[PDB]
Structure formats: C-alpha cells, structure tokens
Design a protein around this ligand. Structure first.
Ligand SMILES: COC(=O)c1ccccc1C(=O)OC
Length: 298
C-alpha cells in the first residue's frame, strides 16, 4: 500500500554526544507537540521505590473515569532516549480517550543502566500500581502498554507476570521490538530511510545489552519464548513500513495460536513511531483502537 502522504512529507523534510542526542530526541518531541498540542489533563508526579532504585512516575487522571483498570505505560526510545515528557502527547490522549488512569514510567536508561535493569524496574512499578489500584477505586489487575522499546518492556513484563504474582488484564504493544536474534523480511526491506534504521538499532543494542549473547535472553527477545499460553489479552499495533513490523505481527499470530485473545492491527502506509507523532491522524485512530479493545476486556 503506498506510503501515507503526510508520512512521505515528514520523511522528506528530515535533515553527537549521548547528552546531545538525548536532547535532540527531546526537542523533536517538543516540536511535534507544538504542532499538535495535547489535550489538557490532570497529572500528579511521584516516585516508586524499585529494586534498582527510585523511579519517577506521572499519574494521569481522566476527566471522566470509564475504564476499571490502571494502565502502566512504558515509553520507547531504544532503551536510551525518551522520558515522561517525550511521551506526554500519547499518554495524555490515552488517558482522556480511554478514560483511564495511566501511570507513565521514567525507567532507567542505557547505557548508564544495562539490561535487565529496566525490566526489573517496570515489574516493580506494575506491582505498585496493582497494590494502589483499589484506593483509586479500580480493579487490582493492570494493563501494561508501551511503544517500541516500551512495547518490548510491556511484552516482557506480561511474560513474567504470573511468575511475579502480578495481575495483568491486558498488554498493549505499539510497534514493539520483540526478537533481537532473527532477521525478518521487514527488517531487510525497510532497513533504512523510515526513521528507525538498522545502524541505530545496532547502536541501541550496544548501549542496552551487556554482551552480544544477551540477544537470545528471553527478557530481551520475548518472541523466543516457546510457551505463550495463558498470557494477557493482547493488542498488537504495527506500522506497514517499519523494520520491526514482521516480528510484531508474528508474535501476534503466535499469541493467537496459543489461545490468547489477540487483536492485530497493521496501519497501512505508516512508519515506526507514528503513535507519538500527532501530525498523523493515524495516531488518534490507533488510540481509538486502544479504547475499543479495552472496552472488550470486562
Ligand atoms: C546475569 O543476569 C541475568 O541474565 C539473569 C538475571 C536474573 C535471573 C536470571 C538471569 C539469567 O538468566 O542469567 C543469570
């Protein structure tokens, strides 16, 4: 299907120390939010005590509460970039459109923290949210969610949830990274020129992983896990022109065949990252998909 016209324009108009690279990523996110301002939303900043230290969070409170579980959201950025501010545009809209309380998580970034530290942190935050939920008037079971590297974390938390005695009602994976071992067709076909590139992915792995062997660890590559039975209901959103497309869709098929209630949606014409790029109407369409999916959980 042709590249979406606005996407095509965005790519055509695209033109460092670690600190500078992080600031650049932050500046781009700011520019997009200036172009398409987020909805106003009540928020509260907090800090959760994890097994690897304090992790800042931001709780988003909907104008009108309509969903009975808290959402715990883990931002993307290759494990190296991003924060609660870079993903505010997405989270504010998830909050208000779903009518859900959302916990956005500022997990520890690489290379300063290495695999599997943020996985541990993300579990600890999920556990905290489950314990708080009754006092917010909610069910203790949580929904985990994330984009890209954040979708990785969400998928891994979900695979660990039973073992960690963590009640999870659903998982929302937005163009996740799931298999660091295998090349897929999309990974070859869209390797360069679609925002998320091959070289960047390599560099992200070099920052996050301890050694090259970690690629086969199931907490890095959750698509490798042989037993997906009994995992939480899954919404897997992919972009057509994304190197990570094929691994995301393959995992959705594997979940489905393992009896996990699964919705798999490819947004045609789109690229990696589109759900934090509000210049594209498909971002809000995908958020509507989330709301529709979550309507069916209870
Ligand atoms: C070396 O750290 C890890 O990879 C790890 C961490 C906790 C539990 C298990 C493991 C493991 O699989 O290898 C020891």
């Amino acid at each position: 299907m042709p590249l979406d016209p606005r996407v095509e324009q965005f790519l055509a108009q695209m033109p460092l120390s670690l600190a500078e690279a992080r600031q650049q990523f932050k500046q781009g996110a700011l520019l997009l939010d200036q172009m398409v301002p987020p909805p106003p939303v009540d928020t509260e900043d907090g800090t959760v005590v994890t097994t690897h230290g304090p992790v800042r969070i931001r709780r988003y409170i909907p104008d009108r509460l309509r969903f009975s579980h808290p959402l715990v959201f883990y931002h993307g950025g290759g494990f190296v970039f991003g924060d609660i501010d870079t993903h505010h545009g997405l989270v504010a809209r998830l909050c208000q459109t779903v009518g859900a309380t959302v916990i956005s998580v500022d997990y520890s970034l690489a290379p300063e923290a290495k695999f599997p530290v943020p996985v541990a942190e993300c579990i600890d935050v999920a556990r905290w949210a489950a314990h708080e939920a009754p006092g917010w008037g909610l069910k203790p079971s949580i929904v985990v969610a994330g984009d890209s590297a954040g979708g990785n974390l969400a998928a891994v938390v979900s695979q660990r949830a039973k073992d960690e005695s963590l009640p999870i009602a659903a998982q929302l994976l937005f163009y996740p990274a799931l298999d660091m071992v295998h090349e897929t067709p999309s990974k070859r076909d869209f390797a360069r020129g679609y925002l998320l590139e091959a070289d960047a992915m390599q560099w992200f792995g070099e920052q996050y992983l301890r050694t090259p062997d970690d690629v086969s660890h199931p907490w890095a590559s959750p698509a490798l896990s042989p037993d997906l039975t009994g995992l939480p209901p899954a919404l897997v959103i992919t972009a057509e022109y994304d190197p990570l497309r094929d691994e995301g869709e393959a995992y959705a098929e594997a979940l489905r065949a393992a009896g996990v209630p699964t919705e798999q949606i490819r947004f045609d014409g789109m690229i990696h990252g589109f759900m934090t790029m509000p210049i594209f109407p498909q971002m809000e369409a995908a958020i509507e998909a989330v709301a529709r999916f979550l309507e069916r959980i209870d």
